[PDB]
UniProtKB/Swiss-Prot annotation, chains A, B:
The chain holds residues 320 to 628 of 1440 of the full protein. Main component of the apoptosome, an adapter protein complex that mediates activation of the caspase cascade in programmed cell death initiated by the intrinsic apoptosis pathway. Recruits the initiator caspase Dronc, promoting its autocatalytic cleavage and activation; triggers the caspase cascade upstream of the effector caspases Drice and dcp-1. Effector of reaper, grim and hid induced cell killing. Produces at least two isoforms that may activate distinct caspases by separate pathways. Disruption phenotype: Pupal lethal. Reduced apoptosis during neuronal development results in central nervous system hyperplasia; a larger number of differentiated neurons survive in late stage embryos and third instar larvae have larger brains. Delayed removal of the larval salivary gland due to defects in induction of apoptosis. Imaginal discs of the eye and wing are enlarged. RNAi-mediated knockdown significantly reduces levels of apoptosis and caspase activity during embryonic development. The gene is Dark. Possesses an N-terminal caspase activation and recruitment domain (CARD). At high protein concentrations in vitro the CARD domain mediates the interaction of two octomeric apoptosome rings to form a double ring structure. Possesses a NB-ARC domain (nucleotide-binding adapter shared by APAF-1, certain R gene products and CED-4) that forms the inner hub of the apoptosome ring and is the main mediator of oligomerization. The interface of the NB-ARC domain and a neighboring helical region forms a binding pocket that can accommodate a nucleotide tri-phosphate with specificity for dATP. In its monomeric non-activated state the binding pocket may be associated with ADP. Exists as an auto-inhibited monomer; this state is maintained by intramolecular interactions between the NB-ARC and WD repeat domains. In vitro, at high protein concentrations or in the presence of non-physiologically high dATP concentrations, assembles into homooctomeric rings 300A in diameter to form the apoptosome complex; two rings can interact face to face (via CARD domains with some involvement of the WD repeat beta-propellors) to form a double ring structure. The octomeric ring may represent a non-functional or off-pathway conformation. Induction: Induced by ionizing radiation including X-ray and UV. This is Apoptosome protein Dark. It comes from Drosophila melanogaster.
């Protein structure tokens, strides 16, 4: 937006990166909070502060905010102001409102939120490894929250040691790098056995019903086949995001 | 009207079912009451609240309105305002104000109202099993009131054991269709021994003075013949719809 660019440019002359992200946390936050001041604080601001846990680029279902027609009427009026855009039927937030104001101001509800960010995903456990995930939230945003809560859920709920979530993520998303972005920045104290085992998994992961279990059989060195057994019991690079009508291709000299 | 339609569409666009009947409990109930603010609670609103005991869309007799001529002029001026249309002398109620206006707001006058709603039919009892039911109200309301009060009065005045209701309702409605709607859900208050007998007679009911006696004679395991003996002491589906004549007809392909 023009005002953010103008204020950032003016701040830079009096650093291109310090004033770009660090400074102006007390000038821009002033005007955006002045705009915020229109809302009734008791009911609205608290619900807004509940929303800090979401990824900066994220869409929000109604049940999650309900945990954290009253809720839908409330979000309706907050949208009516200019603070929460609803679409048919996830809901998202303006970033200019998202990553600046509530980023600065927050209580320790994060834990009460984040355990709820474990409470409902734990309920989303099915007989098989087919849980009713949400396409954008349960597939993507779950990694942040599961890393936020604790370690042991990392070796179970992200199903990296499992196999089904791979199929779910791949088939529902079209696509792969967006998983790697969650495969690398998600390696915490998950012990030597997994630190390294999931790294061996990740080395193979970019290299590509019965097909998935058969290919898991090859990685016998990893426990992937170990649970592929229970599942059956119960081209280096390829682009498909462009579907059809393509002619020619070529590659950067500088390997870029 | 183009007020409830407009507000319901607004609420739905801002769930087609929650906003249909469940939501708007604060915005369809304010307006449905704000319009009624021109009245007084001493005489009008009190009896109007008492009238909530009646079905969502049905009638009200003069005498039963009396026990729950002053009432007559009261409902006359209420008709004048806009509360209770008076017709020749059955009287019916608007469904909007009976249903969405007074359902949420109700004081515990139901006990006296329903005990009176039992007392009047008990007074409306004869030596034989011919009670002085009014044409429409009593036939369509004694079942509800009996289910409201207790099971033995249902056992008596439903006349599942007696045979006279089977004649009176069928020959005063033309049909037994609504008699089946009485029998099917009104099972709760009795005893399961009576309930299985009512199940058997309910199964017998859609299949079909002295003729009724002969029909009841065939059913020997039920008390209907047992009472039919005192009454005399003291086929397949048939519609009969258009009163002039009928030319052609057919059944839907999907049995629908």
């Amino acid at each position: 937006n023009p005002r953010r660019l103008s204020i950032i440019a003016e701040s830079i002359r009096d650093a291109t990166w310090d004033n770009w992200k660090h400074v102006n946390c007390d000038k821009l936050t002033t005007i955006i909070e002045s705009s915020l001041n229109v809302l009734e604080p008791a009911e609205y601001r608290k619900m807004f502060d509940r929303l800090s846990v979401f990824p900066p680029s994220a869409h929000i279902p109604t049940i999650l905010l309900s945990l954290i027609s009253d809720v839908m009427v409330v979000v309706n009026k907050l949208h009516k102001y200019s603070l929460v855009e609803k679409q048919p039927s996830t809901i998202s937030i303006p970033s200019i409102y998202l990553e600046l104001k509530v980023k600065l101001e927050n209580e320790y509800a994060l834990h009460r939120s984040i355990v709820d960010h474990y409470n409902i995903p734990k309920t989303f456990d099915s007989d098989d490894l087919i849980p009713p995930y949400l396409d954008q939230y349960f597939y993507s945003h779950i990694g942040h929250h599961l890393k936020n809560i604790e370690h042991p859920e990392r070796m179970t709920l992200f199903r990296m040691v499992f196999l089904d979530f791979r199929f779910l993520e791949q088939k529902i998303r079209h696509n792969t790098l967006q998983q790697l972005k969650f495969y690398k920045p998600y390696i915490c104290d998950n012990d030597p056995k997994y630190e390294r085992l999931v790294n061996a998994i990740l080395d193979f992961l970019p290299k590509i019903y019965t097909d998935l279990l058969r290919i898991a059989l090859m990685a016998e060195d990893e426990a992937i086949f170990e649970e592929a057994h229970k599942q059956v019991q119960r081209d280096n690079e390829g682009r498909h995001a462009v579907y059809l009508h393509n002619d020619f291709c070529l590659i950067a000299l500088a390997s870029g």
